[PDB]
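INPUT
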Amino acid sequence: DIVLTQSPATLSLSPGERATLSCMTSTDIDDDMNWYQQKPGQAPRLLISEGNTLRPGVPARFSGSGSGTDFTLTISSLEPEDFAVYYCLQSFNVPLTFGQGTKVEIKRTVAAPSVFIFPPSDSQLKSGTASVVCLLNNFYPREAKVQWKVDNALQSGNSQESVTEQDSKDSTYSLSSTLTLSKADYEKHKVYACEVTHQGLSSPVTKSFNR
Amino acid sequence: EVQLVESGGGLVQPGGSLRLSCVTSGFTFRKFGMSWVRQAPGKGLEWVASIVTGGRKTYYSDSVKGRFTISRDNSKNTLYLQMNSLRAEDTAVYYCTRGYSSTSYAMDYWGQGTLVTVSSASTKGPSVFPLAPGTAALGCLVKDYFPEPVTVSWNSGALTSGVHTFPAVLQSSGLYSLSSVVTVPSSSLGTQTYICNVNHKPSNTKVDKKVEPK
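OUTPUT
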């Protein structure tokens, strides 16, 4: 009871376009719906409060509608400042519950990632651990797959990924995939390779090294 | 001018305790309901607890009920969150928040936010390793530090364009790792200098690694 379901998970839109965000509640909440915006490294910012009320200082392109269990946040014309994450919140009853958030990202032309591979440093090897870094740089859309092959043998469960926020300058994403092996294991194998799969790639791209 | 200043966050071990304090200014404190909201890294907003204008009533999320106590002293314009029996999943930026109206707990003003890290790991500075390189890529591996955050700059901040510093990732050892990368001209590689500046305040460590080709 009192579950808030936001939709969609990601809005891919261009500046100037209209944004429609959905937030569904499991029970009537007496129109006590609230909307929040949050930019990276900042506290959330209240846009709309109970009864679909526009907060002071918030532009008119922001508006809130809905009734009962169905509520909508509409951004009439997207600005570059408006691309961010948006949370809904009900304030009808405890426990106060938030929506899971919708990210409104910039839609741009598809761009394949530049793929780089980084062997462990001579420095790091001396420490007893070995990290191999795969780098996927400046791509769109966000979806990408990385698989590690050590001497052609596929690796699983020994890698970790990280993705940057959408670039403010070029609206692309970058990704890192880090393979962690012991110093001993690293020197018991010859070929290290990562395979990348992405929309902008007609074929999977593999970058590798030896010694 | 409205202000919600927080303190009392920081490191703490499982089972340990903390008291978050939020001192408010710019508005009549007693006239408002207050709440705490947290946000685990990479995750969304989660309500922790609310308190009425006075001290009479309190409400807690299922996640913290019985472990946390919210409270306010109107004479000090201060909000408190007593956090006992802390768990790893309590790790979050906790926000001191103010209700916008007298009958709702919907937040309009948010505190600056303080990171609360619940972990058994000890404070440790990062080991910084070079990621050796018409465009070549290079960067620094910022491995095995605790806790967050670290700051990474290149050439003392002179180089910003093309730099990507990835969000940290918690490793099974309890330590964090990230990488900061930048793309540069291949022709400039033996002439231009590339140095990553890694600062980790909690461990009082600063590291400068020069990144050159193999």
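end of record. Chain A has two helices and 19 strands.
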